Design an enzyme around this catalytic site. Structure first.
Site, PDB file in Angstrom:
ATOM      1  N   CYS A   1      25.136  77.216   0.028  1.00 16.56           N
ATOM      2  CA  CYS A   1      25.317  78.612   0.395  1.00 16.56           C
ATOM      3  C   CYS A   1      25.438  79.446  -0.867  1.00 16.56           C
ATOM      4  CB  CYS A   1      26.570  78.822   1.302  1.00 16.56           C
ATOM      5  SG  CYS A   1      27.147  80.534   1.674  1.00 16.56           S
TER       6      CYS A   1
ATOM      7  N   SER B   1      27.611  81.593  -1.633  1.00 17.31           N
ATOM      8  CA  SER B   1      28.991  81.708  -2.204  1.00 17.31           C
ATOM      9  C   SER B   1      29.419  80.516  -3.084  1.00 17.31           C
ATOM     10  CB  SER B   1      30.005  81.963  -1.085  1.00 17.31           C
ATOM     11  OG  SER B   1      29.834  83.261  -0.529  1.00 17.31           O
TER      12      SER B   1
ATOM     13  N   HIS C   1      28.115  81.594  -6.363  1.00 19.18           N
ATOM     14  CA  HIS C   1      29.012  82.565  -6.940  1.00 19.18           C
ATOM     15  C   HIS C   1      30.133  81.903  -7.666  1.00 19.18           C
ATOM     16  CE1 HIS C   1      27.628  85.847  -3.945  1.00 19.18           C
ATOM     17  NE2 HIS C   1      26.800  85.711  -4.964  1.00 19.18           N
TER      18      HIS C   1
ATOM     19  N   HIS D   1      31.287  74.336   1.125  1.00 22.51           N
ATOM     20  CA  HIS D   1      32.102  74.756   2.286  1.00 22.51           C
ATOM     21  C   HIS D   1      31.363  74.835   3.599  1.00 22.51           C
ATOM     22  CE1 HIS D   1      30.091  78.356   0.744  1.00 22.51           C
ATOM     23  NE2 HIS D   1      30.166  78.813   1.978  1.00 22.51           N
TER      24      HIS D   1
ATOM     25  N   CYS E   1      28.970  77.656   7.917  1.00 23.81           N
ATOM     26  CA  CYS E   1      28.987  78.966   7.302  1.00 23.81           C
ATOM     27  C   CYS E   1      27.831  79.835   7.666  1.00 23.81           C
ATOM     28  CB  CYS E   1      29.061  78.874   5.779  1.00 23.81           C
ATOM     29  SG  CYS E   1      29.033  80.570   5.150  1.00 23.81           S
TER      30      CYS E   1
HETATM   31  C1  LIG Z   1      27.186  85.031   3.576  1.00 22.20           C
HETATM   32  C2  LIG Z   1      27.344  83.631   3.509  1.00 22.20           C
HETATM   33  N1  LIG Z   1      28.489  83.075   3.128  1.00 22.20           N
HETATM   34  C3  LIG Z   1      29.561  83.804   2.803  1.00 22.20           C
HETATM   35  C4  LIG Z   1      29.461  85.283   2.858  1.00 22.20           C
HETATM   36  C5  LIG Z   1      28.256  85.847   3.269  1.00 22.20           C
HETATM   37  C6  LIG Z   1      30.550  86.058   2.493  1.00 22.20           C
HETATM   38  C7  LIG Z   1      31.742  85.500   2.096  1.00 22.20           C
HETATM   39  C8  LIG Z   1      31.914  84.134   2.016  1.00 22.20           C
HETATM   40  C9  LIG Z   1      33.104  83.607   1.618  1.00 22.20           C
HETATM   41  C10 LIG Z   1      33.264  82.239   1.593  1.00 22.20           C
HETATM   42  C11 LIG Z   1      32.226  81.384   1.925  1.00 22.20           C
HETATM   43  N2  LIG Z   1      31.024  81.864   2.278  1.00 22.20           N
HETATM   44  C12 LIG Z   1      30.831  83.203   2.379  1.00 22.20           C
HETATM   45 ZN   LIG Z   2      29.244  80.710   2.974  1.00 20.12          ZN
END
Ligand SMILES: c1cnc2c(c1)ccc1cccnc12
Ligand SMILES: [Zn+2]
Ligand SMILES: c1cnc2c(c1)ccc1cccnc12
Ligand SMILES: [Zn+2]
Ligand SMILES: [Zn+2]
Ligand SMILES: [Zn+2]
EC number: 1.1.1.1
Lengths: 374, 374
Positions: free
Chosen positions: B46, B48, B51, B67, B174
Site C-alpha cells: 500500500c 502508506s 510513506h 498493514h 486496507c
Molecule cells: C489510502 C490507502 N491507505 C491508507 C490511506 C489512503 C490513508 C491513510 C492510511 C493510514 C494507514 C494505512 N493506510 C492508509
Molecule cells: Zn493503507
C-alpha cells in the site's frame, strides 16, 4: 383602493457604497403575474445588509436593501395562489421555487432561483418595481425590505400565523432561522452532545438556542467580548470562554475542556482563523463543524486536510439549511406554540426612519438585533 | 508446537529511511496476554507503507511495516476470546477496542487505541515482540505484516470465513475497504447519483466499485494517465476524463458535464490541488466531497470557505469509515457471497522475498496492486 395602482411611499435607498441610507419618496409598482405587494410592518438589521453598504456583498446599486422582515399583503398579482391580501407574510431571501434540482433534493435549500450567487437585483422577470423620481432602483435578494412597501416574486414569500407579532417573527426571515437551523438542521445536534459556538451576537445566540432545543448537554460560547456572555448563558450556554484570557491556542483549551474534542462546532463571526480553530476543536473521528458567517471578503483560508482525514465533517449553509417556504410558517407556528423565545435577541427597536442609527449600533457592536418598525 | 516459544523467521526490515527493505532473520516473541501470533499468507503493498520508506509517514525505525494482509493464527495469549489457532484472520491497522468514546460512537471508526496519530511502534503494552540479532525492532500500526509471523493485540484482529482465499481477501485489510467504504459508508452514495473519482489506482477503483454497489447512475473517472481508463470502466465507471485533454479547469468541465455539479466526489490520489477541485465540482447546495488520501506531506491547502457556505459537505476518513473488527468479517462474507470482485485490483503477485520489486512497481505506477505471498 391601492390595488393595481402605483403606491407612493418612503424607502431607504442606498445610492452609492459607503454612504448612509437616504430616506426617499419612491414609487412602488403594482404586482405583475405571480408577484405579491407587501406592506412592511417590521424589518431587522442584518450583517449582510451592511455588507451591501461596504461593497463586501456585490449587488447592483442604487438598491433598496433589507431582507429580514414581516408585513401584511396589500395585493396579489394574477396567478398568485399561496397568499391573499390581508395575510401576514415573511419575505424569503432564499426562494423555494419547488421545481429546481435543489428544491427537489431532500437536503438542499439554496434554490437556483436565488439572487445571491450572481446578483441581478431584479424581480425574477429581470425588471424592477421601484423608482425614485423616475430613476430605477434595484431590488435586493428578491425581498428589498427597507421600504414601506415591497413587491416580491411568489416563490420568495410565505404565509404565516394570522395572529403572529410581526415585530418579533421578522427575525425568522434571517437571523434566528440562520443560527437555529445551523444547529437543528445542518449540524443536527444530538442529545447529550457538547457544542462550541464561536460568535455570540444574534446569530450565535440563535445557534445556542438550537443546540438547547436539540438537547445538548454542554454548549460552550466563545467570544472576545465578555459582555456578550450573560445573554449567551441566559439563552442556553453552559460556559463561556474568552480567548484573550488564555496563553494557549483556543482549540487546545476547547479540546482539553471537552476531553478530546467537541461534537459540534459553529463559526458564526465570519473570520478565516476562527473557521479553522472551530474545525480543529471538534473531535477528530466524528466531529462536525458548521460555517454560518460570510467573511470580510474573499481570500482563502489555509487549512491542513489531515483535520478531515481522521473523520471530521466540515460544512456550511444559507438560511440554516431550511427549505424556505416549507419551513418559515412552521418556525412561526413553533414560536406561537411557545417552543422558543425571540425577545432575548431584540435589544434595540427604532422607527424605520432612524435606519442609519440602527446601522451605527450594528457596526459598533452595541446591538444584538435592532428591529425597525413602520 | 511452536506455541509459547520464540519463532525464528524472516521479515522485511526497514533499518533507515530512503533505504530498501532488508530481508532479515528475526525472532518473534510468543503472544502475551490478549495477543495473537499470526502466520502470514499474503500482504499487499500500500501507498502508506511507502510513506514509511520516504519519512513521509513518521514512525519509529527500525520497523517491520505492512498493514494490508491476511494469514492464519498459530497461537493465542491468555484472555484471547475472539480467534483460535487455525482461524483465518485479517489484521486491523485501525483497531476496534470497543471501549473508547470513538468505538462507542455510531459514526466513528478511528479508535483511540490507534498507533497512527502519535506513532509509538509498539504493541498496546508499549513493548516489541520483534528482535533482530537481539536488537529491538519496532511494530507498525500494531500490524507489521511484512513478516512470516507477527504478533498483534486482540483489538487489531478479526476472524474471517475459513474458506477465504487469503491471497485475495488480504485487500480488505486496507486498499479495498478504504475505497469502497469511502463511497458506501462515508459518502453514503445514493441510487441514481452522479459521482466523480479523482485517481484510478487501486483505492480509486475500489471507490468506483462502491459507487456502483450503491447504485450510482454516473461514475466519472478522472486521471491524467489514460491507461487507467479501461479497468476503471470495467469495474463500473461510466466515463473517464483526462484533464490534460481540456483547455478549461477540470471542475468547470465536471460541473458542465453534471448539469451544475456532481452529487459525490472523491479525491483518492492525495494531492492538495485536486482536493479543492474535487470539492468545487460537487453541487453547491447538497454536494458531498470525500478525502481518501494522504498528502506528500503537510502543506496546508488554500481554499475559499464560500464553497461550503452554499451547502457543500467536506469530509474524510480512515479505513473507509468502517468499524474495523465489526466490518472486516462481513466484507469477506460479501466477497464469498460474490457481491463484488477483487481480481480486477490484482495486477502483480510476487513472493515475499521480492518485496523491493513490489515497491518499485508501486512507485513507477505500473501496479494497481501487488500481493506478496509467503
Ligand atoms: C489510502 C490507502 N491507505 C491508507 C490511506 C489512503 C490513508 C491513510 C492510511 C493510514 C494507514 C494505512 N493506510 C492508509
Ligand atoms: Zn493503507
Ligand atoms: C444573505 C443574507 N443573509 C445572510 C447571508 C446571505 C449569508 C450569511 C449570513 C450569516 C448570518 C446572517 N445572515 C446571513
Ligand atoms: Zn428552486
Ligand atoms: Zn441575513
Ligand atoms: Zn476504541
Amino acid at each position: 383602493s391601492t390595488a393595481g395602482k402605483v403606491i407612493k411611499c418612503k424607502a431607504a435607498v442606498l445610492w452609492e457604497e459607503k454612504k448612509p441610507f437616504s430616506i426617499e419618496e419612491v414609487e412602488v409598482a403594482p404586482p405583475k403575474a405571480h408577484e405579491v405587494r407587501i406592506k412592511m410592518v417590521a424589518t431587522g438589521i442584518c450583517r449582510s445588509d451592511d455588507h451591501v453598504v461596504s461593497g463586501t456583498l456585490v449587488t447592483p446599486l442604487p438598491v433598496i436593501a433589507g431582507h429580514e422582515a414581516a408585513g401584511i399583503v396589500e395585493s396579489i398579482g394574477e396567478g398568485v395562489t399561496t397568499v391573499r391580501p390581508g395575510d401576514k407574510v415573511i419575505p424569503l431571501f432564499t426562494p423555494q421555487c419547488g421545481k429546481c434540482r435543489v428544491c427537489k433534493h431532500p437536503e438542499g435549500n439554496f434554490c437556483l432561483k436565488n439572487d445571491l450567487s450572481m446578483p441581478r437585483g431584479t424581480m425574477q422577470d429581470g425588471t424592477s418595481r421601484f423608482t425614485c423620481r423616475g430613476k430605477p432602483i434595484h431590488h435586493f435578494l428578491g425581498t428589498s425590505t427597507f421600504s414601506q412597501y415591497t413587491v416580491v416574486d411568489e416563490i420568495s414569500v410565505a404565509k404565516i400565523d394570522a395572529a403572529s407579532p410581526l415585530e418579533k417573527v421578522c427575525l425568522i426571515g434571517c437571523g434566528f432561522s440562520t443560527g437555529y437551523g445551523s444547529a437543528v438542521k445542518v449540524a443536527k445536534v444530538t442529545q447529550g452532545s457538547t457544542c462550541a459556538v464561536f460568535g455570540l451576537g444574534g446569530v450565535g445566540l440563535s445557534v445556542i438556542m438550537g443546540c438547547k432545543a436539540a438537547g445538548a448537554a454542554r454548549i460552550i460560547g466563545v467570544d472576545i467580548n465578555k459582555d456578550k456572555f450573560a445573554k449567551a448563558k441566559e439563552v442556553g450556554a453552559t460556559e463561556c470562554v474568552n480567548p484573550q484570557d488564555y496563553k494557549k491556542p483556543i482549540q487546545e483549551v476547547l479540546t482539553e475542556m471537552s476531553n478530546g474534542g467537541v461534537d459540534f462546532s459553529f463559526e458564526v463571526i465570519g473570520r478565516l482563523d476562527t473557521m479553522v480553530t472551530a474545525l480543529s476543536c471538534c473531535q477528530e473521528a466524528y466531529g462536525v463543524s458548521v460555517i454560518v458567517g460570510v467573511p470580510p471578503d474573499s481570500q482563502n483560508l489555509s487549512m491542513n486536510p489531515m483535520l478531515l482525514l481522521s473523520g471530521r465533517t466540515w460544512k456550511g449553509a444559507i438560511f440554516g439549511g431550511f427549505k424556505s417556504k416549507d419551513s418559515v410558517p412552521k418556525l412561526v407556528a413553533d414560536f406561537m406554540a411557545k417552543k422558543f423565545a425571540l425577545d432575548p435577541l431584540i435589544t434595540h427597536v427604532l422607527p424605520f426612519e432612524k435606519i442609519n442609527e440602527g446601522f451605527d449600533l450594528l457596526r459598533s457592536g452595541e446591538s444584538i438585533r435592532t428591529i425597525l418598525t413602520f
